[PDB]
Design an enzyme around this catalytic site. Structure first.
Site, PDB file in Angstrom:
ATOM      1  N   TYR A   1       0.836  -1.158   0.000  1.00  0.00           N
ATOM      2  CA  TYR A   1       0.000   0.000   0.000  1.00  0.00           C
ATOM      3  C   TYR A   1       0.896   1.240   0.000  1.00  0.00           C
ATOM      4  CZ  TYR A   1      -4.544   2.000   1.241  1.00  0.00           C
ATOM      5  OH  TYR A   1      -5.694   2.706   1.339  1.00  0.00           O
TER       6      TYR A   1
ATOM      7  N   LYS B   1      -3.413   7.571   4.060  1.00  0.00           N
ATOM      8  CA  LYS B   1      -4.490   7.223   4.991  1.00  0.00           C
ATOM      9  C   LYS B   1      -4.203   7.621   6.415  1.00  0.00           C
ATOM     10  CE  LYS B   1      -7.194   5.905   1.870  1.00  0.00           C
ATOM     11  NZ  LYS B   1      -8.531   6.441   1.512  1.00  0.00           N
TER      12      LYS B   1
HETATM   13  N1  NAP Z   1     -11.807  -0.912  -2.593  1.00  0.00           N
HETATM   14  C1  NAP Z   1     -11.357  -1.220  -1.369  1.00  0.00           C
HETATM   15  O1  NAP Z   1     -11.154  -2.553  -0.972  1.00  0.00           O
HETATM   16  C2  NAP Z   1     -11.041  -0.135  -0.389  1.00  0.00           C
HETATM   17  C3  NAP Z   1     -10.558  -0.446   0.900  1.00  0.00           C
HETATM   18  C4  NAP Z   1     -10.267   0.585   1.806  1.00  0.00           C
HETATM   19  C5  NAP Z   1     -10.453   1.914   1.385  1.00  0.00           C
HETATM   20  N2  NAP Z   1     -10.924   2.215   0.119  1.00  0.00           N
HETATM   21  C6  NAP Z   1     -11.137   3.627  -0.263  1.00  0.00           C
HETATM   22  O2  NAP Z   1     -12.326   3.781  -0.982  1.00  0.00           O
HETATM   23  C7  NAP Z   1     -12.326   5.035  -1.633  1.00  0.00           C
HETATM   24  C8  NAP Z   1     -13.023   4.996  -3.014  1.00  0.00           C
HETATM   25  O3  NAP Z   1     -12.444   4.208  -4.065  1.00  0.00           O
HETATM   26  P1  NAP Z   1     -13.050   2.755  -4.482  1.00  0.00           P
HETATM   27  O4  NAP Z   1     -12.027   1.725  -4.104  1.00  0.00           O
HETATM   28  O5  NAP Z   1     -14.434   2.662  -3.956  1.00  0.00           O
HETATM   29  O6  NAP Z   1     -13.272   2.781  -6.113  1.00  0.00           O
HETATM   30  P2  NAP Z   1     -13.186   3.988  -7.197  1.00  0.00           P
HETATM   31  O7  NAP Z   1     -14.501   4.560  -7.554  1.00  0.00           O
HETATM   32  O8  NAP Z   1     -12.436   3.454  -8.353  1.00  0.00           O
HETATM   33  O9  NAP Z   1     -12.478   5.203  -6.403  1.00  0.00           O
HETATM   34  C9  NAP Z   1     -11.719   6.153  -7.068  1.00  0.00           C
HETATM   35  C10 NAP Z   1     -12.528   7.412  -7.026  1.00  0.00           C
HETATM   36  O10 NAP Z   1     -11.631   8.474  -6.823  1.00  0.00           O
HETATM   37  C11 NAP Z   1     -12.033   9.564  -7.601  1.00  0.00           C
HETATM   38  N3  NAP Z   1     -10.940  10.532  -7.723  1.00  0.00           N
HETATM   39  C12 NAP Z   1      -9.595  10.301  -7.675  1.00  0.00           C
HETATM   40  N4  NAP Z   1      -8.925  11.498  -7.772  1.00  0.00           N
HETATM   41  C13 NAP Z   1      -9.852  12.476  -7.889  1.00  0.00           C
HETATM   42  C14 NAP Z   1      -9.748  13.852  -8.048  1.00  0.00           C
HETATM   43  N5  NAP Z   1      -8.552  14.442  -8.080  1.00  0.00           N
HETATM   44  N6  NAP Z   1     -10.907  14.612  -8.150  1.00  0.00           N
HETATM   45  C15 NAP Z   1     -12.164  14.021  -8.106  1.00  0.00           C
HETATM   46  N7  NAP Z   1     -12.246  12.644  -7.949  1.00  0.00           N
HETATM   47  C16 NAP Z   1     -11.112  11.884  -7.851  1.00  0.00           C
HETATM   48  C17 NAP Z   1     -12.327   8.845  -8.858  1.00  0.00           C
HETATM   49  O11 NAP Z   1     -13.089   9.530  -9.803  1.00  0.00           O
HETATM   50  P3  NAP Z   1     -12.608   9.218 -11.336  1.00  0.00           P
HETATM   51  O12 NAP Z   1     -11.812   7.905 -11.411  1.00  0.00           O
HETATM   52  O13 NAP Z   1     -13.968   9.171 -12.055  1.00  0.00           O
HETATM   53  O14 NAP Z   1     -11.781  10.430 -11.799  1.00  0.00           O
HETATM   54  C18 NAP Z   1     -13.022   7.585  -8.429  1.00  0.00           C
HETATM   55  O15 NAP Z   1     -14.402   7.761  -8.564  1.00  0.00           O
HETATM   56  C19 NAP Z   1     -10.872   5.433  -1.727  1.00  0.00           C
HETATM   57  O16 NAP Z   1     -10.665   6.658  -1.084  1.00  0.00           O
HETATM   58  C20 NAP Z   1     -10.102   4.248  -1.158  1.00  0.00           C
HETATM   59  O17 NAP Z   1      -8.894   4.598  -0.523  1.00  0.00           O
HETATM   60  C21 NAP Z   1     -11.224   1.201  -0.755  1.00  0.00           C
HETATM   61  O1  TCL Z   2      -7.021   2.472  -0.691  1.00  0.00           O
HETATM   62  C1  TCL Z   2      -7.529   1.297  -1.179  1.00  0.00           C
HETATM   63  C2  TCL Z   2      -7.257   0.121  -0.551  1.00  0.00           C
HETATM   64  C3  TCL Z   2      -7.781  -1.075  -1.050  1.00  0.00           C
HETATM   65 CL1  TCL Z   2      -7.447  -2.601  -0.221  1.00  0.00          CL
HETATM   66  C4  TCL Z   2      -8.578  -1.066  -2.214  1.00  0.00           C
HETATM   67  C5  TCL Z   2      -8.851   0.136  -2.872  1.00  0.00           C
HETATM   68  C6  TCL Z   2      -8.343   1.300  -2.396  1.00  0.00           C
HETATM   69  O2  TCL Z   2      -8.612   2.467  -3.033  1.00  0.00           O
HETATM   70  C7  TCL Z   2      -7.644   3.082  -3.765  1.00  0.00           C
HETATM   71  C8  TCL Z   2      -6.347   2.670  -3.666  1.00  0.00           C
HETATM   72  C9  TCL Z   2      -5.358   3.313  -4.400  1.00  0.00           C
HETATM   73  C10 TCL Z   2      -5.694   4.403  -5.248  1.00  0.00           C
HETATM   74 CL2  TCL Z   2      -4.424   5.226  -6.186  1.00  0.00          CL
HETATM   75  C11 TCL Z   2      -7.018   4.831  -5.346  1.00  0.00           C
HETATM   76  C12 TCL Z   2      -7.989   4.204  -4.634  1.00  0.00           C
HETATM   77 CL3  TCL Z   2      -9.684   4.737  -4.774  1.00  0.00          CL
END
Ligand code: NAP
Ligand code: TCL
Ligand code: NAP
Ligand code: NAP
Ligand code: NAP
Ligand code: TCL
Ligand code: TCL
Ligand code: TCL
Lengths: 254, 254, 254, 256
Positions: free
Chosen positions: D157, D164
């Site tokens: 990460y 984070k």
């Molecule tokens: N997926 C997991 O297992 C997981 C686990 C823990 C935490 N998270 C957190 O969840 C959050 C959301 O992401 P996701 O994993 O659900 O899928 P995701 O939709 O692919 O998240 C990325 C989002 O970030 C937006 N983004 C990035 N830079 C931006 C900017 N400069 N201005 C406006 N929007 C911006 C993107 O919009 P565009 O791509 O349309 O530009 C996109 O909608 C993240 O903050 C991530 O760290 C995810």
């Molecule tokens: O932080 C995350 C952690 C996990 Cl396990 C899955 C998705 C995540 O979400 C991101 C991780 C890296 C970047 Cl560049 C952008 C996003 Cl939205």
């Protein structure tokens, strides 16, 4: 939200008891409830309190958590009486009043063990027996205080029992997770209740919240109740092993 | 560094005991030591072990921490025998072997309380009595395990005792701080000892360290012993209420 | 203890700088040292301070951590000049003074990023270049403040920078662990220094320590210095990824 | 009780139907809220219009906001003001880092990689909050998404872990500052979920399985499960709660 769900609420002494906040919330969300008390000296008390809620009928069981037998027979009785349950709210602690003051280093062996016994281990058998009434999973919630994570100035032995409770919550989450039973705690901020009077300096505690906590105000029983509604319902299905501070943000500042 | 300092070391069972690592280190730094044991079954054991150290003479005292009397008489005896002391290293824990396996939710009341009793409360009277031998301050150190902060897979009741011990350290630091007595804990990583054999899955635990831990190797008694020397000496004068992980960075990763 | 070990100390501005407590301690333990500064405006300053220490000769290097080039050329020069090193003490932070007051929600983007840049990321390149001078392992230590774990009342952007620093220590410990390089932090309690003047309310902070902290007194640079000596030496070989509070136990109470 | 009619929330960071913020969206939409959506790229605008057919908004509310740009955040939220009136909450679901920083030695990461990650995944919450505050006269609730990797070093990460950690502090410092205006700031530490951004994180598969094997609930969570906790955090059910970090992660955060 919560029709036809059934929960056992443990540790109402009077109208100001935290477990009564929980009770009022769940009752409003249409749940049916089961109440457990330690003493007859609060039984007729409870019957009066219940007039305030809308249970179709009364469910009151004497359970002193010091006695293995009473917890077992208690929960077996709940089984035969209401059928299966969906949750348990644990709102029980105790320590000797002279331990909750003076030097913590001065506390007696029996004081220490008594506190652990009622405030921490009780969760354990309670869980074990409740499990019997939860074939397809459920949710258990216990109440702690910040004094379990940090040394606080008059909490002494109860602080050590809270630290113990918190870990108990984690170890039970791990063990009962595969049976789809979630175990969580609420770390409430100070609220004026009957047991609150045992804790020295409680007034200046109350004021530090108002002055230094982010929300700049104290919480109340109903507020703790609303988080318990969350923990006990399916809104928290992803959530176990957790400790949720309902304390106006005090836990986050220093 | 440490000439003319005196420390009581509690909980050496044999040459692999963590408290023997501490012993060797402090012994090398020129301290004089006082040893406490539970059973005669490890007394003549200890005499042999001491031949390895350079004490000008033997200081051995039977102390079972379940007995108020023995702790009091023990530390009064030390008083009359060596004079005032500078620190105490606590290296004592116990639980029933059948609690350290099976469902944690199945553990007995007496199991629970016994573990709290020996692994947690003992620090408290120990401290209270030791305080009598520490007019101008000193330093107390107890040993814990990560299982005290997170649910680990076979630690169960001992986990809950460690959570309790760690809070005990905090509450003791707060209480004894004004008398210039510091209370700290060392969270050791797994080490192959006599008590280690009680903990199930210990082998796979050992390997997870080697594989996943930042330093990619296990620690040992001497490495715990070196931090103990720091906590017990003036090098840590600013330091109390603290929990120092000697565990190859395992605590920091997930 | 420490003859023939070499350490780079970063961030002495004057005789009250925390890094100068570290300096004095390690110098007393017989180490040789290398000092880095930001401004000429504290260069001749340092030469004066060095008269107080017993270095056989002066080792002074201008390094502004905002400039990749200076950190690289700086550490390459150290290599050519003293050979291989055994540790680095990082004592560097900065934020814009108008960010360290006023609503945290009002802080500017550049304010935020600048603070992260100097107080957090700097550790990273510093480690990367240092690693080049550490073939058989070593030890890196950075300085933090509780404000990194909890919201404190005038710390604002620097608090977010410390949270960042703390996680950077963890991620570096994991990465440099296999090369036998330990990364740790010391969370110091408030000390009266040149940078301390930028933090609002610092006086009432100082007194809360004396009043509510277990040891009931403030710590000082030499006290931080003695913990640094432990982290940097083999006494802490089992220790990495860790955050040791040198703060009179303030971190343990609430 | 009943729940959320006539409440208005801005949802930020939906990229497609697997985005976490779309679990939140579906839950709140079901609870009868009205919503406002913000996106980074046109490349996901017509994407969103499609996704919205699945929800029951009486009309569309879509606003381009790149959080790197002070101007767009300010004009974005001023536009929301004129368009829908005052709001009740904001769900922040935004993070980013350079792909080559999410692998390799963390010690090798570039200055700009580091600052870029902080900028989007951490600082953005701050101006978002600042501007959102203008649309919240009698209080409200802000929620941001984090990951366990913010609290502990996780193996791939790297730079996002340090963002984070920075995000979590930011929530605490904002809770403190906005508390007196009755604005609560909280985070949800989600467990791994298969999303578009998930593909950037190396080893993601073995992460997924460690949850199923070692986590108390012995299964992974999903977007709807994160969505239900967000509903709690955003509603008056959590009135006593600010500065807090709630793990929706099958109990993984509690074991070791
Ligand atoms: N997926 C997991 O297992 C997981 C686990 C823990 C935490 N998270 C957190 O969840 C959050 C959301 O992401 P996701 O994993 O659900 O899928 P995701 O939709 O692919 O998240 C990325 C989002 O970030 C937006 N983004 C990035 N830079 C931006 C900017 N400069 N201005 C406006 N929007 C911006 C993107 O919009 P565009 O791509 O349309 O530009 C996109 O909608 C993240 O903050 C991530 O760290 C995810
Ligand atoms: O932080 C995350 C952690 C996990 Cl396990 C899955 C998705 C995540 O979400 C991101 C991780 C890296 C970047 Cl560049 C952008 C996003 Cl939205
Ligand atoms: N009040 C606060 O600010 C506060 C803050 C944090 C945490 N808490 C926690 O909240 C829980 C209850 O507190 P409260 O404020 O609701 O106090 P309360 O009104 O006094 O409730 C305490 C309850 O504990 C019961 N009890 C004590 N020992 C028992 C035993 N051995 N067996 C069965 N019941 C027993 C009491 O019954 P009897 O009256 O007959 O003894 C009473 O019903 C406790 O876990 C406490 O530590 C309270
Ligand atoms: N081994 C590990 O990987 C590990 C990891 C983390 C923490 N720890 C901790 O390290 C400490 C010591 O364990 P160890 O691993 O060094 O094992 P050990 O060699 O068996 O030492 C444990 C000592 O505790 C003693 N003890 C038990 N009950 C006692 C009592 N009532 N009175 C006096 N002494 C009593 C044992 O005495 P007798 O045998 O004579 O009865 C023994 O001397 C414990 O606190 C343990 O929790 C160990
Ligand atoms: N003072 C306290 O009560 C306290 C408490 C907890 C933690 N800390 C931490 O301890 C560390 C040392 O601070 P201190 O109290 O000793 O303050 P200090 O005496 O003024 O030292 C701060 C040093 O940081 C340097 N610095 C700032 N930006 C720099 C940059 N871009 N490049 C190189 N050096 C830079 C300053 O350099 P120049 O002045 O030479 O330009 C100065 O030498 C800091 O990280 C601080 O956060 C301090
Ligand atoms: O845990 C508590 C924390 C606070 Cl701030 C106030 C009251 C609490 O509850 C108790 C405190 C002491 C005893 Cl003897 C019994 C109970 Cl029920
Ligand atoms: O706490 C420990 C943790 C680990 Cl990983 C290994 C050994 C431990 O030590 C004990 C474990 C169980 C019992 Cl009954 C007594 C002791 Cl001394
Ligand atoms: O972290 C600190 C904590 C305290 Cl109590 C006092 C000083 C500190 O250090 C700093 C704080 C702000 C700036 Cl601009 C520069 C520095 Cl060196």
């Amino acid at each position: 939200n919560l029709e036809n769900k059934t929960y056992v609420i443990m540790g109402i002494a009077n109208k100001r008891s935290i477990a009564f906040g929980v009770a009022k919330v769940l009752d409003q969300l249409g749940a049916k409830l089961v109440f457990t008390y330690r003493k007859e000296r609060s039984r007729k008390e409870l019957e009066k309190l219940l007039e305030q809620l809308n249970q179709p009928e009364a469910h009151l069981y004497q359970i002193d958590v010091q006695s293995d037998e009473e917890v077992i027979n208690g929960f077996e009785q709940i089984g035969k009486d209401v059928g299966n349950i969906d949750g348990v709210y644990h709102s029980i602690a105790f320590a000797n009043m002279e331990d909750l003051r003076g030097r913590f280093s001065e506390t007696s062996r029996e004081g220490f063990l008594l506190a652990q016994d009622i405030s921490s281990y009780s969760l354990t058998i309670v869980a074990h027996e409740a499990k019997k009434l939860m074939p397809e999973g459920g949710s258990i919630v216990a109440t702690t205080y910040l004094g379990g994570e940090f040394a606080v100035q008059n909490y002494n032995v109860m602080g050590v029992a809270k630290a113990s409770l918190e870990a108990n919550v984690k170890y039970l989450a791990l063990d009962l997770g595969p049976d789809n039973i979630r175990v969580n705690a609420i770390s409430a901020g100070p609220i004026r209740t009957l047991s609150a009077k045992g804790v020295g300096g409680f007034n200046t505690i109350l004021k530090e919240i108002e002055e230094r906590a982010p929300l700049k105000r104290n919480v109340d029983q109903v507020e703790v109740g609303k988080t318990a509604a969350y923990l006990l319902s399916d809104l928290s299905s992803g959530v176990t092993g957790e400790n949720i501070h309902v304390d106006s943000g005090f836990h986050a500042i220093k």
